[PDB]
Ligand binder design. Structure first.
Ligand SMILES: OC[C@H]1O[C@@H](O[C@H]2[C@H](O)[C@@H](O)[C@H](O)O[C@@H]2CO)[C@H](O)[C@@H](O)[C@H]1O
Ligand SMILES: OC[C@H]1O[C@@H](O[C@H]2[C@H](O)[C@@H](O)[C@H](O)O[C@@H]2CO)[C@H](O)[C@@H](O)[C@H]1O
Lengths: 162, 161
């Protein structure tokens, strides 16, 4: 029921691309679970949905981001009228977790990408690569390069105060 | 002596930027040693020098690359007439060593960059960052991003079959 759901092996422990996904929601349907994966950033490419976390209910649309971190009790559901499509990057590693603690997003776990954000292009590009993933053509190197670019862009656009 | 020689800590074991350097050579002077560092790619930005490895003697110039790998007995010397300047990136890690085994450059340890090579810009950019390295502005993330771009560019331009 996903356009794309590429799951990668966990062979790197400093920086690792765990999975890349694309899902068109069905109206009024979503997911309600305790997050098991290390970290999963979602980018809303179309339509509307809601993200519920820690007593707060966010009405998200095209351009918005939400991030799932291990242990979060979450619910995210497509709108009954105009159901969202989202792209996601799951990632892990000691370096990945250190870089996430340098961004302001890991508190509220929701954000909006600005006009000239570099984040949408990186997430879309990582999902594009994932559709024809070929490690013998060194797609593994390119995905890690993009993951470093993505975490740099998150810190650049959503900095924690120094 | 070196206008730049930034040495970094070895804290990453999958991919690590070990050092970045810029050296204008002195005529007829060079180095003659067994390489201790994991991997060190040099890009010749001007003049001429020679790289001697395993009985072969290479006359290099602007645009050329040579790579030092741990254990290589090497000699590299600036030309008397027109001494080279080179930029270098030292790097290590299991991923780094796997990706190096995917490029044809680790056979001869020498290459020439094509007209529109992406390699010069990356090495120059990593040395530029190294001059004002500020980890609290996440320069550490940017240098590893550039190292992944560099190894990708080496494989793209100098592939094994
Ligand atoms: O991981 C992003 C992905 O999450 C799916 O939800 C899964 C989750 O991945 C898995 O760890 C958990 O055990 O089950 C969840 C399904 O209830 C979403 O289905 C998918 O749309 C993405 O959001
Ligand atoms: O590492 C590139 C750098 O090497 C210098 O030579 C050093 C080398 O780094 C060190 O490991 C070894 O013990 O001694 C060498 C000096 O003899 C070069 O001086 C420098 O120009 C770069 O090529």
């Amino acid at each position: 029921m996903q356009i794309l759901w590429k799951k990668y092996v966990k062979e790197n422990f400093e920086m690792n691309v765990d999975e890349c996904g694309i899902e068109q929601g069905i109206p009024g349907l979503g997911y309600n679970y305790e997050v098991l994966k290390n970290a999963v950033i979602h980018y809303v490419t179309k339509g509307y949905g809601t993200f519920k976390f820690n007593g707060k209910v966010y009405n998200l649309k095209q351009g918005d981001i939400f991030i799932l971190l291990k242990g979060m009790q979450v619910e995210y559901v497509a709108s009954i009228d105009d159901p969202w499509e989202y792209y996601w990057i799951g990632f892990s590693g000691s370096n990945a977790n250190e870089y996430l603690n340098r961004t302001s997003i890991t508190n509220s776990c929701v954000a909006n990408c600005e006009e000239n954000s570099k984040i949408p292009q990186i997430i879309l590009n990582m999902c594009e690569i994932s559709k024809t993933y070929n490690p013998s053509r060194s797609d593994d190197i390119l995905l890690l390069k993009e993951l470093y670019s993505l975490l740099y862009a998150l810190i650049e656009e959503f900095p924690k105060p120094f």
